[PDB]
Write a protein that binds this ligand. Structure first.
Ligand SMILES: NC(=O)c1ccc[n+]([C@@H]2O[C@H](COP(=O)([O-])OP(=O)(O)OC[C@H]3O[C@@H](n4cnc5c(N)ncnc54)[C@H](OP(=O)(O)O)[C@@H]3O)[C@@H](O)[C@H]2O)c1
Ligand SMILES: NC(=O)c1ccc[n+]([C@@H]2O[C@H](COP(=O)([O-])OP(=O)(O)OC[C@H]3O[C@@H](n4cnc5c(N)ncnc54)[C@H](OP(=O)(O)O)[C@@H]3O)[C@@H](O)[C@H]2O)c1
Ligand SMILES: [Zn+2]
Ligand SMILES: [Zn+2]
Ligand SMILES: [Zn+2]
Ligand SMILES: [Zn+2]
Lengths: 359, 359
């Protein structure tokens, strides 16, 4: 049973089937190994991936499932061989908790592209046990997967950077879209989306937000500093912005038309997909052939870059626009997320509200 | 009318509607300008694009339509300003006959990606008249679009290189798939596909052919030098070749599964689409995200590279494997091409059979 699997008792909220209903769940975590860092969870951002997972949208879900991979907390214990962290330090854990550490990808700081990468939740750890996420009281992870939180970085506002942040920061850098002056488009002004605008602006790029929500126009332009706001619903407005973007970061969580997006790209432009739709997208061959355009994918980021990303965010005072919620509000929050009703990221105040939900 | 539009009478075969039925057609071409090169058409390869066009598969077809853009012939007249071409020289014309010549793309020898590029047929020329292709008695084109044919290359066997050849040569070079030690896959062993294998091997790469025709195995391995032949519908064979390719050149002219192709690619692999299916392809976001893979498109090539391509082909004794046909066999040939019944490129013997079809 989950409660007896490991020596240290743990408590959190989990889903038991694809209805995705979350409720109190008792389990356990391994003892602190020599290279392990144990910490009390203070905050955990809510990623749409969490929603996809509890609902089994991708079909890769095993239950019971404890989601959450934008975890921030305070160190309570460290193994005898830990070097970069001390008890009391503020740390975080993203989407990864392990990898093989013996392949070219891992050697090149790309644990995220390791064929044996281990996800923070819904995966199998090196000890053969299921991984449980951040919607819980405490966490333990190997030092290589521990992110050191900057002193000038709010614990709640910076939590989403652990997944949303690195996921958009990584491709902007890798695909050479972080050049000042370049025109970058962001599709879907949601969790990853609004954070992507912030990073793009910090890199000095001109940003165009492509959205299905006219109500987000003022916030996109006046608060996030987007240079242009396009409603994908408006074919008229889209055509007027034809061939204006050097690259696009698409964060849409559902199947959506790609044709219009390629139209916004300049010759040789790049469309980067980071959203994880449940089903395949439509790709018009002509959209790529005419202008030698590219469509690529990107997943989170390696551990080294994740730390570099949070260090950059702290220097540029970048944080997510969050709505802090109590643990018992999780099911309502999940429905609001499904209905595009959050501006722009939910963050669970685990440290102050989880304990009270114990039956 | 086509016959009165220009001063020089011309004769060829054209389609009048989406049925694609080809028959004798009288038209005309402009007088030889100061920078123009006029030549008698000796051969014209039959590209599947010709088939797509006459059947109006893409919807951009204007009728009457004279296809053909793998044109080879002998110069009969040259303008006073022509610098490198002389009467009697063997020359060729590919998919392009013009561009703006005042933009960045043109300046970078990429007339093919110029927004005002002018296709050899079914386009509008600088004088506002419709362009007619190589299924005709003679051709006239500005010197910048004239390819100088190498002395050691057959006029018929080399004709297909003008479109099929440059189209596969360009991406191999551009996406860095032209190096020994690289394992490349070619999807669809047809007109473009078989020439692609030849160039790939000439570059020194290891080549895997992915086909739906098992009868093509022997020719692929024995004649073209492919190192591996995979039947795309054989899941077991495809599975065993998982993650072995650095890149893939997809020439398929119809909708086909991309998921299996992504499976063959190594991490960070590139899938290059050159085939032009009318309907959209299915693109699973996870196929790109898991491994940071790319799908790109490529169209023919610029004039500078087209000349470099044919020179490279001549140096390596590369030619298309053709079936020479008489002009009056065109409708039967189009039916066979539609049914994937040619090994591997039809080439019209215009110089010896076109005139005979004049009533
Ligand atoms: N690959 C990776 O590494 C990675 C990492 C984290 C998350 N993801 C994935 O990225 C996606 C977004 O996550 P979030 O956490 O950013 O989600 P979110 O907060 O729900 O934001 C998605 C944003 O997209 C738009 N959208 C939703 N449904 C749409 C539809 N049917 N058509 C067009 N636009 C639609 C909305 O923006 P508008 O109101 O502006 O239209 C919505 O605000 C999820 O699929 C998630 O699993 C991938
Ligand atoms: N973008 C550009 O610059 C450019 C330039 C020239 C041509 N093209 C386009 O490239 C495509 C190929 O032209 P070709 O002239 O090379 O054509 P082709 O000679 O007909 O060859 C297409 C080859 O693909 C495969 N194929 C056909 N139907 C298929 C199906 N339903 N499923 C899977 N494979 C299929 C067959 O190979 P197997 O027998 O091995 O399966 C066929 O031999 C056309 O769409 C053409 O318009 C693009
Ligand atoms: Zn996430
Ligand atoms: Zn590894
Ligand atoms: Zn062609
Ligand atoms: Zn131009």
């Amino acid at each position: 049973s989950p409660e007896e699997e490991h020596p240290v008792k743990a408590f959190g909220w989990a889903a038991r089937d694809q209805s995705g209903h979350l409720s109190p769940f008792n389990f356990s975590r391994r003892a602190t190994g020599e290279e392990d860092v144990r910490f009390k969870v203070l905050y955990c951002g809510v990623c749409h991936s969490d929603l996809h997972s509890i609902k089994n949208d991708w079909g890769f879900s095993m239950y019971p499932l404890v989601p959450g991979h934008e975890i921030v907390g305070e160190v309570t214990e460290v193994g005898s061989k830990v070097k970069k962290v001390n008890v009391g330090d503020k740390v975080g854990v993203g989407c990864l908790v392990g990898a093989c550490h013996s392949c070219e990808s891992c050697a090149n700081d790309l644990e995220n592209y390791c064929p044996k990468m281990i996800l923070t939740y819904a995966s199998i750890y090196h000890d053969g046990t299921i991984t449980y996420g951040g919607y819980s009281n405490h966490m333990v992870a190997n030092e290589r997967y521990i992110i050191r939180f900057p002193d000038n970085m709010p614990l709640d506002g910076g939590a989403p950077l652990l997944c949303a942040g690195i996921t958009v920061y990584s491709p902007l850098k890798y695909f050479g879209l972080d050049e000042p002056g370049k025109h970058i488009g962001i599709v879907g002004l949601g969790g990853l989306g609004h954070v992507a605008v912030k990073f793009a602006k910090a890199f000095g790029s001109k940003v165009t937000v492509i959205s299905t929500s006219p109500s987000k126009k003022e916030e996109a332009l006046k608060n996030f500093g987007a240079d242009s706001f396009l409603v994908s619903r408006d074919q008229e407005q889209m055509q007027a912005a034809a061939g204006t973007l050097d690259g696009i970061i698409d964060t849409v969580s559902a199947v959506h038309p790609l044709l219009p997006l390629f139209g916004l790209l300049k010759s040789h432009g790049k469309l980067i997909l980071v959203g994880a739709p449940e089903k395949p997208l439509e790709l018009p061959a002509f959209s790529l052939i005419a202008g030698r355009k590219i469509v690529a994918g990107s997943g989170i980021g390696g551990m080294k870059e994740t730390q570099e990303m949070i260090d950059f965010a702290a220097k540029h005072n970048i944080t997510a626009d969050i709505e802090v919620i109590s643990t018992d509000y999780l099911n309502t929050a999940m429905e609001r997320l499904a209905k595009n009703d959050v501006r722009y990221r939910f963050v669970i105040d685990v440290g102050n509200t989880l304990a009270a939900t114990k039956p």
